[PDB]
Amino acid sequence: STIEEQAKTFLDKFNHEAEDLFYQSSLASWNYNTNITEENVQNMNNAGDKWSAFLKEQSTLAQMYPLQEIQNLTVKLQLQALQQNGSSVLSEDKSKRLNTILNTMSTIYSTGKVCNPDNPQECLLLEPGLNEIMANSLDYNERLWAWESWRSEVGKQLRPLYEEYVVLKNEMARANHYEDYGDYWRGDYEVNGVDGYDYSRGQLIEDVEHTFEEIKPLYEHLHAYVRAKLMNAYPSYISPIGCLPAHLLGDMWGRFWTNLYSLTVPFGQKPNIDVTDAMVDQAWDAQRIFKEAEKFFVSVGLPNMTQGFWENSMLTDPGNVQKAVCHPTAWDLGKGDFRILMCTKVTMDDFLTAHHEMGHIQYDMAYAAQPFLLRNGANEGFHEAVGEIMSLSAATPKHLKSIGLLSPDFQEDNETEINFLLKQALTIVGTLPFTYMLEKWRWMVFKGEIPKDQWMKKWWEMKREIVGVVEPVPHDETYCDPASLFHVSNDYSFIRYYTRTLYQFQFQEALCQAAKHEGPLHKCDISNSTEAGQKLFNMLRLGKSEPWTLALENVVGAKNMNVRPLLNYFEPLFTWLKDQNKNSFVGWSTDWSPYAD
Amino acid sequence: KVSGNYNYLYRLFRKSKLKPFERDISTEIYQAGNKPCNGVAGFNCYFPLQSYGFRPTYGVGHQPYRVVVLSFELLHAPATVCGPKKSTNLVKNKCVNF
Numbered sequence: 001s002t003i004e005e006q007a008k009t010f011l012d013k014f015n016h017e018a019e020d021l022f023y024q025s026s027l028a029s030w031n032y033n034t035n036i037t038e039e040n041v042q043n044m045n046n047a048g049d050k051w052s053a054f055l056k057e058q059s060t061l062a063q064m065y066p067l068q069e070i071q072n073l074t075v076k077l078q079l080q081a082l083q084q085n086g087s088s089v090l091s092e093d094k095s096k097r098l099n100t101i102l103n104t105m106s107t108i109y110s111t112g113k114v115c116n117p118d119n120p121q122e123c124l125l126l127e128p129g130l131n132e133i134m135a136n137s138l139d140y141n142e143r144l145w146a147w148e149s150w151r152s153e154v155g156k157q158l159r160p161l162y163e164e165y166v167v168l169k170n171e172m173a174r175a176n177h178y179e180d181y182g183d184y185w186r187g188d189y190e191v192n193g194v195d196g197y198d199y200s201r202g203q204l205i206e207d208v209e210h211t212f213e214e215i216k217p218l219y220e221h222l223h224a225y226v227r228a229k230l231m232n233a234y235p236s237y238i239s240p241i242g243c244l245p246a247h248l249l250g251d252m253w254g255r256f257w258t259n260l261y262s263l264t265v266p267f268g269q270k271p272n273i274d275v276t277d278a279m280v281d282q283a284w285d286a287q288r289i290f291k292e293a294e295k296f297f298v299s300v301g302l303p304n305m306t307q308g309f310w311e312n313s314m315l316t317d318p319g320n321v322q323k324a325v326c327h328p329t330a331w332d333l334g335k336g337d338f339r340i341l342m343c344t345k346v347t348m349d350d351f352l353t354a355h356h357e358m359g360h361i362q363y364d365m366a367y368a369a370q371p372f373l374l375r376n377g378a379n380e381g382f383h384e385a386v387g388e389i390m391s392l393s394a395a396t397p398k399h400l401k402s403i404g405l406l407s408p409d410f411q412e413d414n415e416t417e418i419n420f421l422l423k424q425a426l427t428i429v430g431t432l433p434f435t436y437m438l439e440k441w442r443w444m445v446f447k448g449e450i451p452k453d454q455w456m457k458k459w460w461e462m463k464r465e466i467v468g469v470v471e472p473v474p475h476d477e478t479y480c481d482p483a484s485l486f487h488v489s490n491d492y493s494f495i496r497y498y499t500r501t502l503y504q505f506q507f508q509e510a511l512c513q514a515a516k517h518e519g520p521l522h523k524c525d526i527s528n529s530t531e532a533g534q535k536l537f538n539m540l541r542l543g544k545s546e547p548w549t550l551a552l553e554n555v556v557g558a559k560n561m562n563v564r565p566l567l568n569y570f571e572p573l574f575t576w577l578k579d580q581n582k583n584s585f586v587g588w589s590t591d592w593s594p595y596a597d
Numbered sequence: 598k599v600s601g602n603y604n605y606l607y608r609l610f611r612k613s614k615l616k617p618f619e620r621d622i623s624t625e626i627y628q629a630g631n632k633p634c635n636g637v638a639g640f641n642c643y644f645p646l647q648s649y650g651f652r653p654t655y656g657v658g659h660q661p662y663r664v665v666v667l668s669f670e671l672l673h674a675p676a677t678v679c680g681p682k683k684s685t686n687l688v689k690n691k692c693v694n695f
């Protein structure tokens with residue numbers, strides 16, 4: 001009779017049929033992913049059409065249900081999650097225009113063709129052309145020309161579509177009762193109805209400012225170190241006191257600096273950490289790799305994998321007999337079913353990726369009994385944060401030697417420690433300032449505080465001081481350089497990377513504290529320690545049924561994200577950087593430009 | 598079967614708790630609210646039966662399990678059903694017990 005029971009019945013029924021419908025859709029998707037066939041194309045076409053229609057119909061049906069302040073904070077989150085119709089709140093013509101613009105940008109990004117004037121007909125695309133051209137060759141002129149040509153051929157046409165896309169998203173968020181699209185995206189972290197733990201949308205911005213103001217010192221220290229190294233390499237093209245060029249960062253857009261580790265290696269003669277020779281000697285396969293993974297997670301106490309995964313999933317590539325994608329993906333079929341897309345190779349990298357994915361599946365059945373919509377994290381960050389904490393647990397030298405892959409006689413040395421910490425800092429720590437800056441720029445653009453005539457000028461200015469990098473070629477108002485990025489064109493937020501990194505470092509410190517480890521944090525190992533596994537499972541079992549702040553506070557006891565674990569992790573690196581950069585200039589000048597004469 | 602064994606049905610929307618050993622077979626239309634639905638089975642009025650299909654790909658803990666329960670009672674009546682006897686093989690021409 002009462003609306004409470006009505007909502008309960010609606011949610012129960014929706015879960016009951018949505019679990020099987022999503023199982024059907026995911027099995028069609030997997031049959032495609034291991035067998036790329038046209039009938040499978042029709043399969044996910046029909047599956048997605050039916051799923052979208054069904055969810056939209058029940059969203060419209062539940063849009064009328066009264067919200068009579070229902071207790072237990074259980075049906076609420078579900079109904080506010082399913083009540084976001086999206087593009088149907090406004091006229092369907094605008095939704096079709098939005099879909100057309102999305103398709104246009106996706107197709108143009110997938111066809112961002114650039115060709116040289118020497119051979120206009122014979123040229124390479126973005127993938128894997130520029131990646132291999134500039135990830136291996138170090139030709140300054142060629143890299144600069146390729147970067148400039150890519151920007152010219154993308155942004156000059158992508159500027160309008162991006163402008164009306166931002167306008168459409170902002171006005172839809174206003175129709176969705178939001179200040180802008182950025183505030184809509186920040187609404188994922190919003191917590192309401194939990195007194196003493198509610199989180200506001202501006203609280204996230206203030207806290208990210210607070211974290212960045214202590215993240216910075218390591219950032220300019222590594223920036224000074226890489227500037228000195230590149231001056232030693234290329235002094236005639238890079239000023240020792242100015243900002244770096246943006247075309248020598250290893251990747252198109254400054255996401256990672258790992259490609260520059262070889263050029264900036266402190267010791268290029270010491271042997272690197274690698275057991276690929278051990279893999280060749282012992283002929284370990286994916287079966288064995290997942291066997292030691294199951295041993296790892298039995299040692300921590302967590303239930304081992306379901307056998308149906310063993311006799312149902314694919315672990316070895318089938319060759320060219322059937323078409324499949326080699327990109328690592330973990331698929332939650334539902335009903336206790338989980339699958340993997342990978343093309344396994346005999347190396348440490350595939351070892352790490354396989355463990356990362358399988359621990360993703362582990363975290364996924366950590367909340368297996370949870371209802372359908374709650375079979376996820378409170379944000380898009382718990383999944384990869386868990387993946388990275390277990391990756392760091394498996395990557396410690398103690399685990400490497402103990403499992404017999406590395407003989408104890410090799411052990412470890414200070415130079416190897418410096419190399420490993422430098423790789424970790426370049427791969428993970430370096431990404432944070434750039435992602436934060438671009439997310440802040442996107443937030444300002446959505447808020448409308450950035451006029452359309454100031455877009456690229458403020459982009460490059462924030463590059464100059466906030467990021468510390470300059471463009472060597474001037475650009476005019478026709479460009480759309482911010483839209484060059486992958487997920488910008490795919491319309492995906494980037495603060496997930498920063499949140500995931502902070503979460504992974506915090507949980508690494510908390511787990512090592514639970515393991516009572518002393519000394520360096522990178523040497524910390526969690527193997528055969530039941531208390532840490534149980535403490536982690538205590539919150540892993542809840543999933544997203546509780547606010548993210550509450551889940552975070554379960555093990556660390558802290559209400560807010562902190563960078564203290566990162567500083568404790570990189571303190572030896574910080575001391576080494578301080579010792580090395582005593583005679584190295586610190587700071588960057590924004591006014592300096594490579595094109596100045 | 599590989600496609601789906603949607604041949605079993607099970608109720609989840611009974612008004613109250615079912616009495617033990619009670620049959621409640623009825624093709625009625627459950628109601629969720631105050632409007633007296635007249636069998637339209639549309640909004641806020643759902644069919645009490647839900648899909649109960651199964652597939653071989655399902656993992657442990659969700660695959661179908663056939664279950665049987667045997668009911669016993671001790672009301673006063675002549676013996677009807679009971680177990681057999683030990684039946685030791687016969688021995689002859691010796692002082693034994695029977």
Ligand SMILES: *[C@@H]1O[C@H](CO)[C@@H](O)[C@H](O)[C@H]1NC(C)=O
Nearest residue numbers: 034035036037038039322323
């Ligand atoms: C992949 O699809 C083709 C055509 O649809 C089929 O002949 C083949 O058997 C399939 N492979 C597997 C492993 O099912």
Ligand SMILES: *[C@@H]1O[C@H](CO)[C@@H](O)[C@H](O)[C@H]1NC(C)=O
Nearest residue numbers: 008012070071072073074075
């Ligand atoms: C919330 O509902 C669940 C099941 O519906 C129940 O087990 C739990 O006790 C409820 N919590 C509160 C605070 O009412």
Ligand SMILES: *[C@@H]1O[C@H](CO)[C@@H](O)[C@H](O)[C@H]1NC(C)=O
Nearest residue numbers: 291294295298303304305307
């Ligand atoms: C998985 O754990 C169960 C529970 O102890 C155990 O019986 C089984 O042997 C384990 N599987 C493997 C492959 O060790």
Ligand SMILES: *[C@@H]1O[C@H](CO)[C@@H](O)[C@H](O)[C@H]1NC(C)=O
Nearest residue numbers: 299398402525526527528529
């Ligand atoms: C877990 O137990 C094994 C068996 O004795 C032992 O070799 C291993 O060192 C233990 N784990 C740790 C972290 O010491």
Ligand SMILES: [Cl-]
Nearest residue numbers: 246253463481
């Ligand atoms: Cl840039």
Ligand SMILES: [Zn+2]
Nearest residue numbers: 356360384387
């Ligand atoms: Zn992952």
